[PDB]
Design a protein around this ligand. Structure first.
Ligand SMILES: [Zn+2]
Ligand SMILES: [Zn+2]
Length: 315
């Protein structure tokens, strides 16, 4: 082996970084380490500008799309050179066999068990079609137990529409797939937990999963469209959107990417790669498995209710 795995990785990365004009300091300081994603994301950004200036993202931030590209590029780099860093899987993602578009009206959470119907009233809007993790079956809507996977939907039916969207999006891009149509590509890490030794935090332990309506996609005329990808959204006008583990309406971040854009980050990195290497290495995004490590970490604190009385008890 002419040069080590690490030296091989490094030579491929430097080739990329020179070809794409990355900042000199990013280049100088790049050492192929597991948290060094910024120089690779700059490769990706520069290629986007050069080759895909009009790319339209939907419920996705520019920065998150480009960072995910960086992560997927990091993964192919590490596979090319055969370098792995134990406990630092590079993509920060997983493949969830969701089963949320199999049965009509029916959702399943990360545990793989069906979600229970709840009422969720917000203030005043009455959602009669909420869904909770079965472990949260006795909590108020949108409160989570120590056994929760963290998943809740205020509107079950819109959630299912978003899962049908991603499934049809995948059918359109892989019409002949033998496998993977029922899998969701999902991130396991936002900025808050992108490093394995990050400071522990309370709340949800995985990027939040939320369906967003594409409210104008119905005001659209289906007959003019032949692109099956686009048709997935016309027929199912809602997107799965991933945000921070604990998005702010503890740490929190601006991570935001829709499921189709996330898939696109991977597909587009496969194109960047093919313009630079003759073969695409094997690159395995882990299959998601429920484990107790992903449990919501609630803090349930009693709060006193007001009593006009001076004294607690009559004697
Ligand atoms: Zn669950
Ligand atoms: Zn976050």
């Amino acid at each position: 082996p002419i040069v080590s795995a690490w030296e091989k990785g490094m030579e491929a990365a430097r080739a990329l970084m020179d070809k794409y004009h990355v900042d000199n300091d990013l280049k100088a300081n790049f050492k192929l380490l597991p948290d060094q994603v910024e120089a690779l994301a700059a490769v990706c950004k520069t290629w986007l500008n050069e080759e895909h200036r009009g790319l339209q993202l939907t419920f996705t931030s520019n920065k998150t799309f480009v960072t995910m590209m960086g992560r997927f590029l990091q993964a192919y780099l590490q596979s090319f050179a055969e370098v792995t860093y134990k406990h630092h899987e590079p993509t920060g993602c997983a493949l969830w066999l969701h089963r949320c578009a199999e049965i009509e009206g029916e959702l399943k959470c990360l545990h793989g068990s069906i979600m229970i119907n709840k009422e969720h009233v917000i203030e005043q809007i009455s959602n009669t079609d909420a869904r909770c993790c079965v472990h949260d079956a006795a909590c108020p809507a949108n409160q989570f137990s120590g056994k929760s996977c963290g998943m809740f939907f205020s509107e079950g039916a819109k959630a299912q529409v978003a899962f049908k969207q991603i499934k049809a999006f995948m059918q359109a891009l892989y019409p002949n797939a033998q496998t993977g149509h029922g899998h969701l590509l999902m991130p396991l890490r936002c900025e808050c937990n992108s490093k394995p030794g990050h400071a522990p935090f309370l709340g949800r332990q995985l990027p939040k999963l939320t369906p967003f309506a594409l409210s104008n996609a119905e005001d659209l005329d289906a007959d003019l469209i032949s692109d099956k990808s686009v048709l997935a959204s016309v027929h199912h006008p809602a997107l799965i959107v991933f945000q921070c583990c604990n998005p702010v309406y503890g740490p929190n971040c601006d991570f935001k990417i829709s499921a189709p854009d996330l898939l696109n980050a991977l597909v587009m990195v496969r194109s960047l790669w093919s313009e630079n290497f003759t073969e695409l290495p094997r690159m395995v995004v882990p299959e998601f498995k429920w484990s107790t490590k992903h449990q919501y970490r609630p803090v349930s604190l009693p709060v006193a209710h007001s009593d006009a009385r001076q004294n607690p008890f009559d004697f």
